[PDB]
Amino acid sequence: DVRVRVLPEVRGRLGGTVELPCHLLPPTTERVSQVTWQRLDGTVVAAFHPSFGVDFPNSQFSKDRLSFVRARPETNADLRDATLAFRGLRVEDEGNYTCEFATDPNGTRRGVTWLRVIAQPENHAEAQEVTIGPQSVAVARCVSTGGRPPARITWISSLGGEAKDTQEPGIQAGTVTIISRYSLVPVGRADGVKVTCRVEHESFEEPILLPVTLSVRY
Ligand SMILES: *[C@@H]1O[C@H](CO[C@@H]2O[C@@H](C)[C@@H](O)[C@@H](O)[C@@H]2O)[C@@H](O[C@@H]2O[C@H](CO)[C@@H](O)[C@H](O)[C@H]2NC(C)=O)[C@H](O)[C@H]1NC(C)=O
Protein backbone atom coordinates (compact mmCIF):
# COMPACT_ATOMS: atom_id res chain seq x y z
CA ASP A 1 0.00 0.00 0.00
CA VAL A 2 0.82 3.75 -0.26
CA ARG A 3 -1.04 4.80 2.86
CA VAL A 4 1.07 2.48 5.10
CA ARG A 5 4.86 3.11 5.58
CA VAL A 6 7.18 0.14 6.52
CA LEU A 7 10.71 -1.24 5.83
CA PRO A 8 10.58 -3.95 3.21
CA GLU A 9 13.21 -5.98 5.06
CA VAL A 10 14.55 -5.94 8.66
CA ARG A 11 17.60 -7.75 10.18
CA GLY A 12 18.39 -8.69 13.76
CA ARG A 13 21.05 -10.82 15.39
CA LEU A 14 19.81 -14.10 16.85
CA GLY A 15 19.10 -13.32 20.49
CA GLY A 16 19.09 -9.58 19.73
CA THR A 17 16.43 -6.94 19.16
CA VAL A 18 14.59 -5.33 16.17
CA GLU A 19 12.16 -2.53 15.40
CA LEU A 20 9.52 -3.03 12.75
CA PRO A 21 8.44 0.50 11.72
CA CYS A 22 4.88 1.23 10.62
CA HIS A 23 2.90 4.39 10.04
CA LEU A 24 -0.21 5.66 8.23
CA LEU A 25 1.25 8.15 5.75
CA PRO A 26 -1.81 10.23 4.71
CA PRO A 27 -2.40 12.37 7.77
CA THR A 28 -6.19 12.34 7.28
CA THR A 29 -9.01 12.89 9.81
CA GLU A 30 -10.33 9.26 9.76
CA ARG A 31 -10.25 7.14 12.87
CA VAL A 32 -8.15 4.01 13.24
CA SER A 33 -10.70 1.34 14.08
CA GLN A 34 -7.68 -0.83 15.16
CA VAL A 35 -4.07 -1.87 14.36
CA THR A 36 -2.75 -5.42 14.06
CA TRP A 37 0.38 -7.28 13.02
CA GLN A 38 0.05 -10.65 11.46
CA ARG A 39 2.60 -13.09 10.23
CA LEU A 40 1.80 -14.38 6.77
CA ASP A 41 0.89 -17.82 8.25
CA GLY A 42 -1.99 -15.91 9.88
CA THR A 43 -0.68 -15.62 13.41
CA VAL A 44 -1.71 -12.32 14.94
CA VAL A 45 1.26 -11.15 16.97
CA ALA A 46 0.19 -7.86 18.53
CA ALA A 47 -2.84 -5.57 18.27
CA PHE A 48 -4.50 -2.41 19.58
CA HIS A 49 -8.28 -3.01 19.73
CA PRO A 50 -11.03 -0.44 19.46
CA SER A 51 -12.01 0.16 23.10
CA PHE A 52 -10.39 -2.84 24.73
CA GLY A 53 -6.77 -1.46 24.39
CA VAL A 54 -3.40 -3.05 23.41
CA ASP A 55 -3.15 -6.84 23.12
CA PHE A 56 -0.69 -9.69 22.44
CA PRO A 57 -2.81 -12.81 21.79
CA ASN A 58 -0.22 -15.47 20.95
CA SER A 59 1.64 -17.36 23.69
CA GLN A 60 4.94 -17.34 21.77
CA PHE A 61 5.08 -13.63 21.37
CA SER A 62 4.27 -12.55 24.84
CA LYS A 63 4.03 -9.02 26.13
CA ASP A 64 7.36 -9.66 27.92
CA ARG A 65 9.05 -9.91 24.52
CA LEU A 66 7.06 -7.70 22.15
CA SER A 67 5.86 -4.16 22.61
CA PHE A 68 4.84 -1.11 20.63
CA VAL A 69 7.69 1.40 20.38
CA ARG A 70 5.32 4.27 21.23
CA ALA A 71 3.20 3.11 24.20
CA ARG A 72 1.15 6.16 25.58
CA PRO A 73 -1.40 6.82 22.75
CA GLU A 74 -3.48 9.95 23.51
CA THR A 75 -5.64 10.44 20.46
CA ASN A 76 -6.17 8.85 17.07
CA ALA A 77 -3.14 10.54 15.54
CA ASP A 78 -1.19 8.72 18.32
CA LEU A 79 -2.31 5.58 16.49
CA ARG A 80 -0.66 6.28 13.17
CA ASP A 81 2.57 4.68 14.47
CA ALA A 82 2.23 0.94 15.03
CA THR A 83 6.00 0.40 15.32
CA LEU A 84 6.70 -2.94 16.99
CA ALA A 85 9.80 -3.95 18.97
CA PHE A 86 11.00 -7.56 19.35
CA ARG A 87 13.47 -8.36 22.13
CA GLY A 88 15.15 -11.75 22.64
CA LEU A 89 14.88 -12.85 19.01
CA ARG A 90 14.44 -16.51 18.32
CA VAL A 91 14.72 -18.09 14.95
CA GLU A 92 10.95 -18.52 14.96
CA ASP A 93 10.43 -14.74 15.10
CA GLU A 94 11.55 -14.82 11.46
CA GLY A 95 8.71 -13.99 9.10
CA ASN A 96 6.76 -11.71 6.77
CA TYR A 97 4.84 -9.48 9.09
CA THR A 98 1.83 -7.54 7.91
CA CYS A 99 1.12 -4.23 9.55
CA GLU A 100 -2.56 -3.51 9.07
CA PHE A 101 -4.56 -0.40 9.95
CA ALA A 102 -8.35 -0.69 10.18
CA THR A 103 -10.04 2.60 9.16
CA ASP A 104 -13.75 3.51 9.44
CA PRO A 105 -15.87 2.23 7.96
CA ASN A 106 -13.88 0.97 4.95
CA GLY A 107 -11.50 -0.32 4.00
CA THR A 108 -8.27 -1.31 5.76
CA ARG A 109 -4.69 -0.61 4.51
CA ARG A 110 -1.41 -2.45 5.15
CA GLY A 111 2.39 -2.86 4.68
CA VAL A 112 4.71 -5.90 4.83
CA THR A 113 8.13 -6.17 6.58
CA TRP A 114 10.36 -9.18 6.16
CA LEU A 115 11.83 -9.93 9.58
CA ARG A 116 15.09 -11.93 9.21
CA VAL A 117 17.03 -13.36 12.15
CA ILE A 118 20.83 -13.61 11.55
CA ALA A 119 23.34 -15.76 13.40
CA GLN A 120 27.09 -14.99 13.24
CA PRO A 121 29.10 -18.15 12.63
CA GLU A 122 32.32 -19.29 14.10
CA ASN A 123 35.07 -19.93 11.53
CA HIS A 124 38.51 -21.58 11.48
CA ALA A 125 40.88 -23.21 9.06
CA GLU A 126 43.74 -25.58 9.70
CA ALA A 127 46.23 -27.43 7.52
CA GLN A 128 46.13 -31.22 7.35
CA GLU A 129 49.56 -32.75 7.14
CA VAL A 130 49.59 -35.38 4.39
CA THR A 131 52.25 -37.67 2.85
CA ILE A 132 53.04 -37.35 -0.86
CA GLY A 133 51.12 -39.85 -3.04
CA PRO A 134 48.96 -40.52 -6.15
CA GLN A 135 45.46 -40.08 -4.71
CA SER A 136 44.09 -36.60 -4.06
CA VAL A 137 43.30 -35.95 -0.39
CA ALA A 138 42.32 -32.92 1.73
CA VAL A 139 45.41 -30.87 2.42
CA ALA A 140 43.42 -28.14 4.12
CA ARG A 141 40.04 -27.54 5.67
CA CYS A 142 37.91 -24.68 6.80
CA VAL A 143 34.86 -24.79 8.96
CA SER A 144 32.11 -22.13 9.23
CA THR A 145 29.86 -23.30 12.04
CA GLY A 146 26.48 -22.10 13.33
CA GLY A 147 25.88 -19.48 10.62
CA ARG A 148 22.53 -18.12 9.51
CA PRO A 149 22.09 -17.89 6.64
CA PRO A 150 24.70 -20.48 5.59
CA ALA A 151 28.09 -18.89 5.18
CA ARG A 152 29.92 -19.01 1.90
CA ILE A 153 33.42 -20.49 1.76
CA THR A 154 35.78 -19.99 -1.11
CA TRP A 155 39.55 -20.53 -1.30
CA ILE A 156 42.45 -18.47 -2.62
CA SER A 157 45.03 -20.95 -3.90
CA SER A 158 47.96 -21.05 -6.32
CA LEU A 159 47.71 -24.84 -6.45
CA GLY A 160 45.35 -26.59 -8.82
CA GLY A 161 42.96 -27.96 -6.23
CA GLU A 162 39.24 -28.56 -6.05
CA ALA A 163 37.51 -27.20 -2.97
CA LYS A 164 34.57 -29.41 -2.26
CA ASP A 165 32.53 -28.48 0.73
CA THR A 166 29.61 -30.01 2.51
CA GLN A 167 26.86 -28.70 4.79
CA GLU A 168 25.44 -30.01 8.04
CA PRO A 169 22.99 -28.25 10.28
CA GLY A 170 24.48 -26.57 13.30
CA ILE A 171 23.77 -27.34 16.94
CA GLN A 172 21.32 -24.40 17.04
CA ALA A 173 18.02 -24.69 15.27
CA GLY A 174 18.02 -22.35 12.33
CA THR A 175 21.85 -22.35 11.93
CA VAL A 176 24.04 -24.31 9.45
CA THR A 177 27.67 -25.44 9.32
CA ILE A 178 29.85 -25.56 6.24
CA ILE A 179 32.93 -27.81 6.15
CA SER A 180 35.26 -27.03 3.24
CA ARG A 181 38.01 -29.50 2.33
CA TYR A 182 40.56 -28.37 -0.17
CA SER A 183 41.96 -31.31 -2.11
CA LEU A 184 44.71 -31.64 -4.76
CA VAL A 185 47.13 -34.66 -5.01
CA PRO A 186 49.89 -33.85 -2.55
CA VAL A 187 53.10 -33.02 -4.44
CA GLY A 188 55.78 -31.53 -2.15
CA ARG A 189 55.91 -28.02 -3.55
CA ALA A 190 52.69 -27.66 -1.56
CA ASP A 191 54.64 -27.48 1.66
CA GLY A 192 54.58 -24.01 3.23
CA VAL A 193 52.37 -22.51 0.52
CA LYS A 194 49.98 -20.02 2.12
CA VAL A 195 46.42 -20.62 1.01
CA THR A 196 43.45 -18.54 2.25
CA CYS A 197 40.07 -19.78 3.44
CA ARG A 198 37.57 -17.09 2.71
CA VAL A 199 34.28 -17.00 4.50
CA GLU A 200 31.52 -14.55 3.43
CA HIS A 201 28.58 -13.97 5.69
CA GLU A 202 26.00 -11.27 6.25
CA SER A 203 27.13 -10.56 9.84
CA PHE A 204 30.60 -9.45 8.67
CA GLU A 205 31.12 -6.28 6.60
CA GLU A 206 33.79 -8.01 4.56
CA PRO A 207 34.75 -11.58 3.90
CA ILE A 208 36.91 -13.22 6.54
CA LEU A 209 40.38 -14.31 5.41
CA LEU A 210 41.89 -17.28 7.23
CA PRO A 211 45.46 -18.04 6.20
CA VAL A 212 46.73 -21.64 6.08
CA THR A 213 50.22 -22.95 5.28
CA LEU A 214 50.13 -26.38 3.73
CA SER A 215 52.24 -29.29 4.99
CA VAL A 216 53.59 -32.32 3.12
CA ARG A 217 55.70 -35.12 4.44
CA TYR A 218 59.02 -37.00 4.36
C1 LIG B 1 9.15 -13.15 2.77
O1 LIG B 1 8.69 -12.49 1.62
C2 LIG B 1 9.72 -12.32 0.67
C3 LIG B 1 9.22 -11.44 -0.47
O2 LIG B 1 8.40 -12.20 -1.33
C4 LIG B 1 6.80 -11.93 -1.57
O3 LIG B 1 5.78 -12.61 -0.86
C5 LIG B 1 6.10 -13.96 -0.65
C6 LIG B 1 5.07 -14.59 0.28
C7 LIG B 1 6.14 -14.69 -1.99
O4 LIG B 1 4.85 -14.69 -2.56
C8 LIG B 1 7.12 -14.01 -2.95
O5 LIG B 1 6.95 -14.54 -4.24
C9 LIG B 1 6.89 -12.50 -2.98
O6 LIG B 1 7.95 -11.88 -3.67
C10 LIG B 1 10.17 -13.68 0.15
O7 LIG B 1 11.24 -13.51 -0.75
C11 LIG B 1 11.09 -14.44 -1.83
O8 LIG B 1 11.34 -15.78 -1.44
C12 LIG B 1 11.01 -16.65 -2.51
C13 LIG B 1 10.68 -18.05 -2.02
O9 LIG B 1 9.36 -18.03 -1.55
C14 LIG B 1 12.20 -16.57 -3.44
O10 LIG B 1 12.10 -17.53 -4.48
C15 LIG B 1 12.19 -15.17 -4.03
O11 LIG B 1 13.38 -14.98 -4.77
C16 LIG B 1 12.04 -14.06 -2.98
N1 LIG B 1 11.49 -12.87 -3.64
C17 LIG B 1 12.15 -11.74 -3.86
C18 LIG B 1 11.37 -10.65 -4.57
O12 LIG B 1 13.32 -11.57 -3.53
C19 LIG B 1 10.59 -14.59 1.29
O13 LIG B 1 10.76 -15.90 0.82
C20 LIG B 1 9.56 -14.58 2.41
N2 LIG B 1 10.08 -15.26 3.58
C21 LIG B 1 9.33 -16.09 4.30
C22 LIG B 1 10.00 -16.76 5.46
O14 LIG B 1 8.15 -16.30 4.05
Swiss-Prot record:
<feature type="glycosylation site" description="N-linked (GlcNAc...) asparagine">
    <location>
        <position position="106"/>
    </location>
</feature>
<feature type="disulfide bond">
    <location>
        <begin position="142"/>
        <end position="197"/>
    </location>
</feature>
<protein>
    <recommendedName>
        <fullName>Nectin-2</fullName>
    </recommendedName>
</protein>
<comment type="function">
    <text>Modulator of T-cell signaling. Can be either a costimulator of T-cell function, or a coinhibitor, depending on the receptor it binds to. Upon binding to CD226, stimulates T-cell proliferation and cytokine production, including that of IL2, IL5, IL10, IL13, and IFNG. Upon interaction with PVRIG, inhibits T-cell proliferation. These interactions are competitive. Probable cell adhesion protein.</text>
</comment>
<feature type="glycosylation site" description="N-linked (GlcNAc...) asparagine">
    <location>
        <position position="96"/>
    </location>
</feature>
<comment type="similarity">
    <text>Belongs to the nectin family.</text>
</comment>
<feature type="disulfide bond">
    <location>
        <begin position="22"/>
        <end position="99"/>
    </location>
</feature>
<feature type="topological domain" description="Extracellular">
    <location>
        <begin position="1"/>
        <end position="218"/>
    </location>
</feature>
<feature type="domain" description="Ig-like V-type">
    <location>
        <begin position="1"/>
        <end position="115"/>
    </location>
</feature>
<feature type="domain" description="Ig-like C2-type 1">
    <location>
        <begin position="121"/>
        <end position="215"/>
    </location>
</feature>
<comment type="subunit">
    <text>Can form trans-heterodimers with NECTIN3. Interacts with CD226 or with PVRIG; these interactions are competitive and have a differential functional outcome on T-cell activation, either positive or negative, respectively. Binds with low affinity to TIGIT.</text>
</comment>
